[PDB]
Amino acid sequence: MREIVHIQAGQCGNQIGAKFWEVISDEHGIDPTGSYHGDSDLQLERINVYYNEAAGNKYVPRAILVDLEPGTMDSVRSGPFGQIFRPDNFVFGQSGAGNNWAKGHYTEGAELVDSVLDVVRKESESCDCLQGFQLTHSLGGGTGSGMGTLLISKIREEYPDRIMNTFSVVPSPKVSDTVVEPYNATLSVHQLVENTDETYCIDNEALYDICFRTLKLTTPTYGDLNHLVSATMSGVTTCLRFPGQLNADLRKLAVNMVPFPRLHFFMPGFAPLTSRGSQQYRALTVPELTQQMFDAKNMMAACDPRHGRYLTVAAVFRGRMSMKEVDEQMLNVQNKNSSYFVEWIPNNVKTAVCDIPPRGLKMSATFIGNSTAIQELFKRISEQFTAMFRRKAFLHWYTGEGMDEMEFTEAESNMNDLVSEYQQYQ
């Protein structure tokens, strides 16, 4: 029961996915050759949530790896845990996507998507009771954004009563990584508003801030950033894979975190994150962890949470702890600072607890916030997009693939509507 199918699309999506599979593997005591070397029966009890068993006690992640160019996936295969994946689950094209949503969604991606869908169907048929799908991609490129969105559309059409959740890497206000980012992001976001149940919004600038300000890390690698993201990802599904006092679930989280269907864009966080120098200096108390969790500096989106209000927040705690303490802390936060929580939803904080903590920690926590502050990201994207579109700058690359102006206007309209909705509850 409760099988989850993973899809990783494009460069960033595949890279983050590799790290995620490493982390999950280590959590379950699975080595790169698919052999189990754990010490606890809890490690295998719910291994089926992420893994499929093969002859000779081999475990193979239910992961589908998708790209329009072979490089990234060749690197992944060459990598440490790369040999753990099913070879038949690498689905790739030959021509690149040129950071072009239209190529991912309408042309190059359209040619490949049926093949991906077939693999997806095959995997879903092996599920006793499939919970849903997890997707990893970027919003600013062509493959993860265009192809990824397309895949989501297809799967929701075919499996409309399953959970569809994405970890989506978004552009950052200071330092864009591509010139057409606003166009791609807007085109993706338009589709995600209507075709996903929840989306975790990750901002690389926030990750860098975490690495520098919090972790005191002089020289963060993308690998290190990926690790953090993977940790957050693992947190979300912990309650499917292990016992607890309050057993959470994806669906439960959705129920408690989405008060209106379109408002499903979350700011993720993780705790504790402490510098290697200052480890003995910190006392690892639930209160202190809570404080870390709620600190804007420990968020992974391009928002100031203090510039908005929390509609709902879900906290998932890992390790041994007093439920009394947890509840009291939650009460204290809300009573003290009631202005930062929407007044029309009493008890804005939901708590879940899983007994088994991650490696190397006695306690940890994962934070998921639905804040009206997220509107700032959307507003900024919209401004950027309009700045370009009003001059039809770069547009020939998209019209050449058959897109029309009207689609862009529709996207803009959707964006603005979303922003307006967010402003309502602000």
């Binding site: 005191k216 510098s275 120098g277 200052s278 003995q280 200096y281 006392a283 690892l284 209160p287 404080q291």
Partner: protein
Amino acid sequence: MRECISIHVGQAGVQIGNACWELYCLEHGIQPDGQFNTFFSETGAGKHVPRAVFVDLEPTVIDEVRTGTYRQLFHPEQLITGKEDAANNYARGHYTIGKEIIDLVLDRIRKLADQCTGLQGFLVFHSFGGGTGSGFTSLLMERLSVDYGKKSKLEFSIYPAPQVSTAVVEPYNSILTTHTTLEHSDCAFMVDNEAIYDICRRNLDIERPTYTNLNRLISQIVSSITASLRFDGALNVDLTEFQTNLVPYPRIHFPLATYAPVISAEKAYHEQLSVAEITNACFEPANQMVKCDPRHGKYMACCLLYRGDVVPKDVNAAIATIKTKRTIQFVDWCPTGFKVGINYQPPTVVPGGDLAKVQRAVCMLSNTTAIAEAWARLDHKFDLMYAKRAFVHWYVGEGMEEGEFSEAREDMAALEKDYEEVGV
């Protein structure tokens, strides 16, 4: 439980703080690597971590601390740093550079408070005269007042000496500090370097001293002040009691701090070191730790903190004797002019130190009209300087205004008048 947070600001303050922390470690058996709750916050690995705020705008003193012996003891945050110092400029502390760091400091303080289940308040270490210790400290204090209100804010301050100094903009800064910590700090305990040197010359029989020795001496006093929070004893004094007992009027809140016996190994054996003798020494003009004669001033209120072997009867007798002396003048309106605190725990000797082991030691905190003279002197100095508008372009060039100085002078005059009134 009873918990307090230390704040150390500047160079001088930081130096003092180092000594203090060493002393604390020696007292409670904590190793330099952290292997009590009142000062040391305890974590889940048999590790004890100080509960202090260490602030400097120049990254030198802090860097030294970070590299030295007690680096593993302190947190990598408690020790806070800047980029450029104020350079004996109140304006660069209070207005320009301080408002970059202050927020962080405040946050740290809040965090520390959160970690306590009964915060008695604050102990702050700065210097009247220094650039950071004047302005930045003032700024911090104001913020603290705004935030907490009824949490104790005690200050330990290095007052500029009359006949000696180490900076030729020291009158201005000190005056400014006085102006902007008159409506915030509850107590501002005073030590003077010249006085300490004199003491060293006289009692210790040492005439080649250095700052380290002075710091150690200051730390002893600090320990004595704070010994009631960390050990048992008859008459356990609190940080909140000092305010009640040494501040008759809210503007009047600068009491002198003196320690006895400050004596070397050679004449520790010659002397009896009885309680009465120690008490007498405490009230002697030369033994005081500032440059003022308490014969030229009436004692408003005094506080005595006996530490070690003390029969309370003996203490009482000593007090009676003191009262008898013609101192030794008291004010008309304060007959009961004594507060007494006793601890079973004796003083603690620091290896490679000035002082020998003793059975019993005493720390006296006295609020008197003798400091009025000092204030007047300072005012005169200021007047002499400001008449020609000397150095004012530095202060005005970073925030201040012509008029503020005048206001400060007026305030000082008012203070003097108040003191005079009290004297009557």
